[PDB]
Symmetry: C2
Subunit: 188 residues, 2 copies
């Protein structure tokens, strides 16, 4: 009866945007797998924080399905996500079974690369707007967190807590999100 989350971790990912959702989702009782795009080996994030993934994406792919697939940002991280055929397959499968897809900052640009969720309202980091909108395939929002259908997007490292709590609220409900939020000492 446990919800499951896949977090895809590539070289150059924004480490804050990786750790905050993982930590919060685990506080909410979600089983999170931090899966390394390139293997089980340690991943050097954008600000040189080095994180050990729980599994390779190859192995984590076989233990599906997940209730949410999480794509962190960081410019080089999103580019590695956008170029990976394994991500495309995971995302396409998740879209077909109507599971949640969550991406933050530059992460939403992987969606465009993989032709995921066309027609949806999305937000990105402001500096990633032009890239996300090449072709007019999405409608842009400046909300800090945006949720359209099964696509949940958010804007930057500073929105990471709100992004993560929105994932909790979607998987586990508003009361669990409120319960996990209180000990964090957020402002609003």
């Amino acid at each position: 009866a446990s919800k499951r989350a896949l977090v895809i971790l590539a070289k150059g990912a924004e480490e804050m945007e990786t750790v905050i959702p993982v930590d919060v989702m685990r506080r909410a009782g979600i089983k999170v797998t931090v899966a390394g795009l390139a293997g089980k080996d340690p991943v050097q994030c954008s600000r040189d924080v080095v994180i050990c993934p729980d599994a390779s994406l190859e192995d984590a792919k076989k233990e599906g399905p997940y209730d949410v697939v999480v794509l962190p940002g960081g410019n080089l991280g999103a580019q590695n996500l956008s170029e990976s055929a394994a991500v495309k397959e995971i995302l396409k499968e998740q879209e077909n079974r109507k599971g949640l897809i969550a991406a933050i900052c530059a992460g939403p640009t992987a969606l465009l690369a993989h032709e995921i969720g066309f027609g949806s309202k999305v937000t990105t980091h402001p500096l990633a707007k032009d890239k996300m909108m090449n072709g007019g395939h999405y409608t842009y929002s400046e909300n800090r967190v945006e949720k359209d259908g099964l696509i949940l997007t958010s804007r930057g490292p500073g929105t990471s807590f709100e992004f993560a709590l929105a994932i909790v609220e979607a998987l586990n409900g508003k009361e669990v999100a409120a319960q996990v939020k209180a000990p964090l000492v957020l402002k609003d």
Copy 2:
């Protein structure tokens, strides 16, 4: 001419409170060393995020002095900090040369354990208040970030960004802090 920061990383540390200051301080151009209390080996944080430190605390101690020593929280992490003789020595030396000491959430309780900064105004996580105040050696504040003399404290994972930016402002000044803050997409 580069400012230097030491972040002391122990088993059971709050990984969000570790990664957010490291990342922000590095955005501000500070040279940060993430030093593992027990050695160079990977550290399992409170929510099972596993981080590789840059160096052992033993080696990092020899490359001093630092303009700021940073103590993350997490209950078991702070307890490991409070029990470590190496931390006591580092903190006592930092206090003597009038360098900044920064601690968040449960982290300030290591200060009490090590008889650091008595008489100062401090804040902690609400759940750590009773422990910090055993003996009446500090004055308690409920400000989200509190700075009294060379002691900078903060309350919880949700105050991590404000804590980190306060470190930046103290080391590098208000304009650098404002410059690093803008791309993060913080609310206030």
